[PDB]
Amino acid sequence: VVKRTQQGNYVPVRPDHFAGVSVALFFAKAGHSKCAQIVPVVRQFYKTTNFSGEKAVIEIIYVSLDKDEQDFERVRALMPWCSVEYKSCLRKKLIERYRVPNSTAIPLLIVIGPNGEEAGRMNFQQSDEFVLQRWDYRFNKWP
């Protein structure tokens, strides 16, 4: 239901992976202007904060609101973090449960506590760009 992209093919991800870190769900499009804007800065931030140190510290599960297999695969193939399966029910469960209207509501970062609920809400559709440094993982990390 959640997929880790690795060297050669795609592997279901280890249950030990999400333990001990902060997990953010990244609500996004494919081909959208702000989506293409926000992908690389989040990639840079992810790279610097995980490779600065020994253990992985954050993990972003990317969730799509695309209507195409090709679009989903295309936007998914070029990312270092994991994603959610397109056909899995949990993606639509997350959409209905968080109330993205499916626009000004994309992209979105909702950082999640152990309880699978909203530990923090953050929107990119604004002038400021220091929100990436603003999200801190030392305050909401799981069991």
Partner: protein, 426 residues
């Protein structure tokens, strides 16, 4: 941060400025619809130097398209990358300054300045504090040479602590359009030395020499020549947008270059300029870049620099250069070309490193030289002006628009003084 306000004037200006935004949009990777693609943070970490955010993610250029003839920039709108420019930034005219410097400045221009000064200050005052201006125009024409020079004079008295630098073409020696060249040139120069900080001269048949001897192209149009000028304009202001070893600013090369306030007219170079055929012989490295800096056929203006001595010059290298072979050879060319430079300045010739090479090449260098070779070129216009002033050729078109017999004699004397100041310094 720092803002550069772009203003294009005249027919020449709008056509050049069209290809300048071609290359600048290409340096940073903005799609012509305005969206960004190129996925690199160092590309557009300094994006606000030329463009503005629009809460759709689109970047609109801080350009003010400016003329009196409503067709020539109508062309720019329908062209490629014309949909970038803001519709409010257009300031149309109706009548058209028919190659008369007089009506560009005093009579016909004065009712349109009420609009163009409004739009320039609304974009100026919006930011923190401004850095410079860009004016692309011609000093042979009517609507660029005269009516553009008004916009030079008004914004200077409103922002005296800011800088501005222009790219202006002049009359060519053999070919010459626009039979009132020296009236338009000389009237423009004596206003330009009084209200402008820095001018880059371009000659038309010098550009033609480039595309024959170097580029090995038989029959391309203005598109190719504007591409060479657009690269030169991108090369000078590269360092504002990207970091480097030895940094540069427009004002820092301003203080470095001009010795005295009166003389600020600059030559232009660029490399590499070999053809498709000759590409595989060359293995691009630091010493052969410097050798085709000091090649007279590679000079953007066709005043032969071997006759004069270079007063000072700058070289904004771009790419990943090793700085020892940069500066040692930079000194080497000063020792090798001993007579080509002036004696009373030690270290005539300068350098910078601009850490991002232009895409499609790996090492590039832009030459800006304050030479005294412009002695003969302004002397050309001086004699051309005296030929049609001895008994008032073509004078009635100017005189009818509020000109004076006295103000023509001042323009001759004032521009002749600029000739004298260069000749004194040898």
């Amino acid at each position: 941060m720092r803002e550069i306000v772009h203003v294009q004037g005249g027919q020449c200006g709008n056509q050049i400025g069209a290809k300048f935004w071609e290359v600048i949009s290409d340096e940073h990777g903005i799609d012509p619809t305005g969206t960004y693609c190129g996925d690199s943070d160092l590309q557009l970490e300094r994006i606000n130097v030329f463009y503005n955010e629009a809460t759709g993610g689109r970047f609109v250029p801080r350009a003010i398209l400016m003329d009196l003839e409503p067709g020539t920039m109508d062309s720019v709108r329908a062209g490629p990358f014309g949909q970038l420019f803001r519709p409010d930034n257009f300031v149309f005219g109706q009548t058209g300054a028919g190659n008369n410097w007089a009506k560009g400045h005093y009579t016909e221009g004065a009712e349109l300045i009420d609009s163009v000064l409004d739009v320039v200050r609304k974009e100026a005052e919006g930011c923190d504090c401004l850095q410079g201006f860009q004016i692309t125009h011609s000093l042979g024409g009517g609507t660029g040479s005269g009516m553009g020079t008004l916009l030079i004079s008004k914004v200077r008295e409103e922002y005296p602590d800011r800088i501005m630098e222009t790219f202006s073409v002049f009359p060519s020696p053999k070919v010459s359009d626009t039979v009132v060249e020296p009236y338009n040139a000389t009237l423009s120069v004596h206003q330009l030395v009084e209200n402008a900080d820095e001018v880059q001269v371009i000659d038309n048949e010098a550009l033609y020499d480039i595309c024959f001897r170097t580029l090995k192209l038989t029959t391309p149009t203005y598109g190719d020549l504007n591409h060479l000028v657009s690269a030169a304009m991108s090369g000078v202001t590269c360092c504002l947008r990207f970091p480097g070893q030895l940094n540069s600013d427009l004002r820092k090369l301003a203080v470095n270059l001009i010795p005295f306030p009166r003389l600020h007219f600059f030559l232009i170079g660029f490399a590499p300029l070999t053809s498709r055929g000759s590409q595989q012989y060359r293995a691009l490295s630091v010493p052969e870049l410097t050798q085709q800096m000091f090649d007279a056929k590679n000079m953007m203006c066709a005043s032969d620099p071997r006759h004069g001595r270079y007063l000072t010059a700058s070289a904004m290298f771009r790419g990943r250069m090793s700085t020892k072979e940069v500066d040692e050879q930079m000194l080497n060319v000063q020792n090798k070309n001993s007579s080509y430079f002036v004696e009373w300045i030690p270290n005539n010739m300068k350098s910078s490193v601009c850490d991002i090479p232009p895409k499609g090449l790996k090492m590039s260098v832009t030459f800006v030289g304050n030479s005294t070779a412009i002695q003969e070129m302004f002397k050309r216009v001086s004699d051309q002006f005296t030929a049609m002033f001895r008994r008032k050729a073509f004078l009635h078109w100017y005189t009818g628009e509020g000109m004076d017999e006295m103000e023509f004699t001042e323009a001759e004397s004032n521009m002749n003084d600029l000739v004298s100041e260069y000749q004194q310094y040898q």
